[PDB]
């Protein structure tokens, strides 16, 4: 097993950059829209403190710089919605894909386009934490990067980076421009939450062990979903919701182990161990993997 | 720190269907040419021992097909060159990037593009192994998917995937069609030679985890390069030379911490294991990341 992100080319036609003064990141030209972070406004002095509202009255159309690698991009009109600006141009992006504007819950994967200067650089999977960080691997320049999944040719975009932490966890919004989780778009020091593990996720990879034929944890036992909830937050695990049952459903059919068996099955490992054992070659359960990308690996 | 592939969009626009009989699998169409794997040509009863110079004179343009998404191509020539098949067709490639064949050496890395059908489905990062097997994840219909470098906007292919062995490791060649490693393009059950780990790599990736912060692992004990490599090749690593501390040089140079210091660092963690910690979350001895894939990433 290992992390397979979606092949990237859909978005790197729609990567640009933008620049305000000598504040760059990139943006995302979707149609005749092009999507970035509202902190490019800032000057040096703003970003600590910014007056967003105050910061845009003083700017006009011919303020912004977009650029398609180095032809320019004319902006004809722009607005801000929440912490992203929305930059009208004068050129429909003719690479633009089929898309959607998704908001994503914690656990769910996506691939992460990492830009610098509107140059795509490199394509990695990452996960949303519980506490709304993501591990990402992300440079200078990065602001404005873009994660995202493909559905039969169909783009969803999901995140849209802006700011590393101070822990090195990395966090953002959604293209509408709201944040994950309770983070600002300012250059002030703000904490993770303490994070959890993602139990949805380490259930996942129970199931994509029982397919490979690596069954030997399943135990006789089975629990009701508040009892195991109750019983996981102790280990610093996340309760699950009754989207995350659903969403094992596929696995659990496939397997015909029920979900409440394998939580049942995780109960005994969090209050137990695992002894030496290994778990598909692996002493440490994986909680980065969704029951989608399970199955993506597996069928 | 992550394993980050290159973008893939270069390469999605080559990626093609080649169809014989009811024999199928992906073609790279490079200008007016489709390269692909030359067990195209087998009917199931052809693979298991395949004499291919027979198996093609006793074929016409016509017994190809090609798809390029719903387009189909018009094969107007044929030849083979070792275990890869050249078609040439009536159409160029509009989306041909600027491009070169190379042969890798073991150690170094590249991207997958891993596509079923004629249809990219993901893309990592993989390494070429010592053994000349590479640890990628490839099901049913990837034959013929390929893996690449890309520098300043040139794609370097270096693998075209053939085939999975026992064990779940894959074998393929490079882009003139000679294999890496002493497998050929048969169904047969095939073993691989003894996997020596790529000592440079691990060895970069340790600087990885410094430059991120992680340092339980060092210390201040001393080693010669001989007496270092005595404990490495008891341990079936490879032999660590001069050229390989030079190419470590940028990093121990940001790190501030000696080549031979760190390998004075990996001989006691072959000596006395990990304890139960991890390195970068890795419970064991990461060995896909070369020293310009740290120096990327981390720069
Ligand atoms: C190491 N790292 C990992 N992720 C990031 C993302 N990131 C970023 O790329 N840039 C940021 N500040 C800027 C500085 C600029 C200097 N010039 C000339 N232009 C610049 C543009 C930007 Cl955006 N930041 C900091 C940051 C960005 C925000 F969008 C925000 F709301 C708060 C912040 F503190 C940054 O995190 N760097
Ligand atoms: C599980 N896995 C991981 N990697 C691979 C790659 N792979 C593959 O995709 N296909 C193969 N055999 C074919 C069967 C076909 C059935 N039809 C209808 N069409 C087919 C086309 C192919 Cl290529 N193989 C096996 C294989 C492929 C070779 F090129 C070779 F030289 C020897 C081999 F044993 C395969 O490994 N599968």
Same mark, same amino acid.
């Given at each position: 097993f290992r992390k397979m992100a979606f092949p990237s080319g859909k978005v790197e036609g729609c990567m640009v950059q933008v620049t305000c003064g000598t504040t760059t990141l990139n943006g995302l030209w979707l149609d005749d829209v092009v999507y970035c972070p !509202?902190?490019?406004?800032?000057?040096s002095e703003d970003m600590?403190?910014?007056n967003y509202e105050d910061l845009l009255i003083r700017?006009? *159309?011919?303020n912004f710089l977009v650029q398609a690698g180095n032809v320019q991009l004319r902006v004809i009109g722009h607005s801000m919605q929440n912490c992203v600006l929305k930059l009208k141009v004068d050129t429909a992006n003719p690479?633009?894909?089929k898309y959607k504007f998704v908001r994503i819950q914690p656990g769910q994967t996506f691939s992460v386009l990492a830009c610098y200067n509107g140059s795509p650089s490199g394509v990695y999977q990452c996960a949303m934490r519980h506490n709304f960080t993501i591990k990402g691997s992300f440079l200078n320049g990065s602001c404005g990067s873009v994660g995202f999944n493909i559905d039969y040719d169909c783009v969803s975009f999901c995140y849209m980076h802006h700011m590393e932490l101070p822990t090195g966890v990395h966090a953002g919004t959604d293209l509408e421009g *709201?944040?994950?989780?309770?983070?600002? =778009? !300012?250059?002030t020091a703000q904490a993770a939450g303490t994070d959890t593990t993602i139990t949805v996720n380490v259930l996942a990879w129970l199931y994509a062990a029982v397919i490979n034929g =690596? !069954?030997?944890?399943?135990? !006789?036992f089975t629990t009701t979903l508040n009892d195991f909830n109750l019983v996981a937050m102790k280990y610093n695990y996340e309760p699950l919701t009754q989207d995350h049952v659903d969403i094992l459903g596929p696995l659990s059919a496939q397997t015909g182990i029920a979900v409440l068996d394998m939580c049942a099955s995780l109960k005994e490992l969090l209050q137990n161990?695992? *002894?030496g054992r290994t778990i598909l070659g692996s002493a440490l359960l994986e909680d980065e993997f969704t029951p989608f990308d399970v199955v993506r690996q597996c069928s």
């Open positions: !509202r902190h490019v406004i800032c000057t600590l403190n910014p700017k006009s *159309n011919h690479k633009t894909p *709201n944040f994950y989780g309770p983070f600002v =778009d !300012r250059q =690596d !069954r030997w944890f399943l135990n !006789r161990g695992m *002894n």
